[PDB]
Amino acid sequence: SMSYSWTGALITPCSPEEEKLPINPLSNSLLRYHNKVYCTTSKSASLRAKKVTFDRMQVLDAYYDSVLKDIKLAASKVSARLLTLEEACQLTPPHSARSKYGFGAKEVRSLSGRAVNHIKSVWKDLLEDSQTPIPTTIMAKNEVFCVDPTKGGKKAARLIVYPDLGVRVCEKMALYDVTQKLPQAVMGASYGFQYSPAQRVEFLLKAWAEKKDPMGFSYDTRCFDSTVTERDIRTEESIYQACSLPEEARTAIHSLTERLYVGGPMFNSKGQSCGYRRCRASGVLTTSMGNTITCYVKALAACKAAGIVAPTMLVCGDDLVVISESQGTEEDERNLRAFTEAMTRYSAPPGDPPRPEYDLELITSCSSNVSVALGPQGRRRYYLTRDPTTPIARAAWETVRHSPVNSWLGNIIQYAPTIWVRMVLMTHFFSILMAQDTLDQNLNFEMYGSVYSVSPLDLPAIIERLHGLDAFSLHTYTPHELTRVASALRKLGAPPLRAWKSRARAVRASLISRGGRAAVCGRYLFNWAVKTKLKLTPLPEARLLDLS
């Protein structure tokens, strides 16, 4: 019942890794300069391994049995199809890790003979063999964060476990359609990845308002992936099998479950046997759907066992938020402890113990929270925000190491109406773009399930369509939000908001001097930086539509 077994071999890197950066341009200020940012590397891999390696004690009950029955009934309402080899190859991202069999993403997408023939043999093998464990590679993820003294030492690198490219294409042929339909079918509104920022805000406000006396809480499972058992994974397969699927897919799904999802041998970058996994692999197609559904099942059963009154849940993988009817502060705490005890028995122990919350602004769901500000007519306007420490630390890093994929562009788009995106990120990046003279150059940013490409000059139209014109007129932010943003800049050692405000005026003027689309960006995105506001009318943005 151990999540992992290790041989002793180390988790090794592929290319040299840099954890501490040279110079920082964001936390830049004539007499004030700092660099309190870092990147996780292979060096902390052993520490992470220790943390995620433990025995899982799982014991189910009637509450769990009941919920699982309901979910399988809901799943039987779903029909899914196999993807063709061509479709599977086309869904393969352009730079996904190459195969050890002489081909890479490029060849998969161009349907080269070598790649196609290999994938076909892998598929045939899945239909013929439902037992032989499929090997996986384990690597330490390189992610950037800001040092946070008060909250303890630096984070250890997360561990990524994934199978060969050939197997990944096959997972899509067999389960991609299911991943796109199943979660919403069994969870409905509770499925978190179906909402745009404005939609998520609407869901939370509605949920909170429908309670006579609301009480909410976020549950943080300690290393969720490591807590899911072989039995949990086989149960996920039974849920998949409850759907209406072609026999060929059923065969492939069973094989993938027994040979890959339920666990298997892991090798490091050097090819050395590193260990055996008996929990969720982070790099397989079903990770998101599996975590989401399994978290939901355990959480719903735990709500019933704990006596949670009228729970409204929002699930994003291992991220869970429960809003219900308060039974009084003392009883709420008692019910939460009961919920936690139930979750623990289901093998979903808490990292940070949950606590009842009676202020919606303080409830974090899917890494975000709802806040409020005033619109142009003075009425309350709700929007989605989040602690800006990590996104700014990564924006500051991606400025000295402008990687192929940006995270700042994504944050600017998803959190466009926030004060930290408007005062800090937009000011900074439009300044960098003009300095580099690459304003019209298209860039690749990362939304969660799909990498996209966009031109910075298209931001105002994109933002209007995504958040409405209010995104350019929001004012009178809450003191909690102002305080949190100021704390982030302090932790990053970057100039404070009052200084960014001075800078935004200069950036705005520069954009307007360039005329054209750049001028539109200046007038719309920085109308907040001048006392005499501009009218700002609807833009021809009613010519776009996004997926994520």
Ligand SMILES: Cc1ccc(C(=O)N(c2cc(-c3ccccc3)sc2C(=O)O)C(C)C)cc1
């Ligand atoms: C993105 C954006 C930035 C500023 C404003 C704004 O109009 N103000 C504000 C200035 C602030 C400020 C200035 C310096 C340091 C910290 C905060 S906070 C604030 C507000 O309306 O909430 C006025 C009180 C002058 C509206 C939107």
